[PDB]
């Protein structure tokens, strides 16, 4: 999507959203094949991604680029979406005006999702979005009241039913808006409900390559959440979507053969290894991290889409 | 005809296998009215059972014990029942040569069939079998094994198909051995098929007590996996079967009535919402577990009875 016009303005100053972005042995200002990957929540993009996606992608062909919101991506994901819409314009300036593509974990979908609702300049310079166990719904299983009751910004905002959440669907975000791949797992253990193959689930986009490794693999078929982003299956897929003309993963290019649920094969054994243990960075960096007791205000050009709902500074009200 | 004759050896030391039973407020020497708990792949003895079967059978008056084969029952079946069988043999010794119940959840019910049929000396030991969604046919889910994933060891012998499932029906296993019940689901999203309320069913046992809950309860009744073990109707079926003078659930104690698929009514409202999240252990234990491309060799006690089949070291013959 619904926004259109100019691009909401940024809360952070330009150096210290460039700040945040790193490419592979190449400048954002001059790269040949970037690919953006935007990292999880509770992890910088080398903590996400070192293990995996950076030298799978550079195997590819690409120059890998992330981004590291601080303190790992615990703030305010409407902060974090500045790092990424920032991205966008530096690499798709800095690789000659080419579309480039993205790929997340967790978290960095919805990023990513946010950031191409609510900045229509990035819309057209994202060529496709490969996304690794999305919450666009968020999660059921956040648990913000859980134990002590105070949790980190983003995971208010990543929590079932959260003032976020309500204002990315209703402000169409819950269709594609580049074409994307969506791949996750029933059995994931941190974003829920994922179970169903449908617009139910979490992780579903309407117009999406939505792929469920259960649909393709069998009822039976486990990775969790980080299986999501590191399995040999996930590779398949995502090699698929990067490489395909429509944008998305085609059905032809992966099988039951592809169903292997250990870390990539290419993978070197140190990156194996460190691609099996990724949660444990993350689950430190949430228990260290900011908490707090309310979910962050909407910022104003969200606002209109969450008339209703509860943030820190109260109900939102009708914006002018 | 069952076989006969002196049990297997064991290939694990009695210390090991003693290692993993333990029973509540009890040493398993010296246990009155001991029932042992068999629990599900990917779960230790209190995940399956701490939510539900240990209070429910204290409740009873039983001590609950239990087994718990490491890693999470994802290692090869085989072994998995040497821990049943060495449980069964130490709790009828500590509870004075009378025999005991044994309750299964999932593969716990085909390692208890798999030790009846494979290790004789046991037959007079074990008083009934209550069996929650047993797979004694495997399961269909995981669909066929020439094309079977990367899978832990009892994984590959739970998958229709395996020479584990072969050995156990070809040696006489689907058929009971001791007085049995089998509760299970035609909803269950682990086990098929489970629809039929006939011996296609892979919880089914002839001669068994088998009560699928839809034939009971209606078409509109669902119950999972986990819920066929931890129901309300679960519960009223298995308090039959432990109480029954058959030995087997008595159709004169359960009805329409007992038809409520939620956990069951004497669980504290804690125990209650950890019954309804049992699977999510086994999840991560299969994520963290033993993975390997081929079904474990057969011992060679059951290789007779899988000839032709196919597992890591080749082609079973009766060796």
Same mark, same amino acid.
């Given at each position: ?44 993009? &080398? ?6 996606? /950076? ?6 062909? %690409? ?28 690499? %798709? ?22 950031? +191409? ?50 204002? +990315? ?7 594609? /808006? ?11 253990? /941190? ?71 250990? &870390? ?50 109260? /109900? ?5």
């Amino acid at each position: 999507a619904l926004p259109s016009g100019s691009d909401p303005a940024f809360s952070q100053p330009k150096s210290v959203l460039d700040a945040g972005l790193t490419c592979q042995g190449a400048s954002p200002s001059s790269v040949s094949k970037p690919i953006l990957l935007v990292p999880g929540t509770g992890t910088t993009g &080398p903590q996400s991604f070192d293990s995996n996606w /950076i030298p799978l992608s550079t195997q590819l062909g %690409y120059t890998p680029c992330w981004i590291s919101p601080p303190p790992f991506m615990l703030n305010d994901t409407q902060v974090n979406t500045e790092y990424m819409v920032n991205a966008i314009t530096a690499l %798709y300036a800095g690789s000659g005006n080419n579309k480039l593509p993205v790929l997340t974990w967790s978290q960095g979908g919805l990023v990513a999702q946010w950031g +191409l609702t609510f900045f229509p300049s990035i819309r057209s310079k994202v060529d496709r979005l490969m996304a690794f166990a999305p919450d666009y719904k968020g999660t059921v299983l956040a648990g913000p009241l859980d134990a002590l009751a105070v949790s980190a910004p983003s995971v208010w905002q990543q929590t079932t039913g959260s003032a976020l959440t309500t204002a +990315l669907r209703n402000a169409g975000g819950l269709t594609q /808006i580049v074409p994307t791949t969506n791949l996750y797992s029933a059995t994931d253990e /941190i974003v829920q409900p994922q179970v169903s193959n449908s617009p139910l689930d979490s992780s579903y986009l309407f117009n999406g390559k939505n792929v469920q490794a259960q649909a393709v693999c069998g009822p039976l078929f486990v990775i969790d959440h980080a299986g999501s982003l590191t399995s040999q299956f996930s590779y398949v897929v995502g090699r698929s979507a990067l490489r395909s003309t429509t944008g998305q993963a085609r059905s032809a290019d992966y099988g039951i053969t592809d169903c292997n649920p250990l &870390p990539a094969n290419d993978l070197t054994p140190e990156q194996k290894v460190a691609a099996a243990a990724l949660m444990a960075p993350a689950a430190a960096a949430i228990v260290a991290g900011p908490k707090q007791n309310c979910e962050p205000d909407l910022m104003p050009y969200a606002r209109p889409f969450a008339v209703g709902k509860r943030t820190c500074s109260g /109900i939102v009200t009708p914006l002018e």
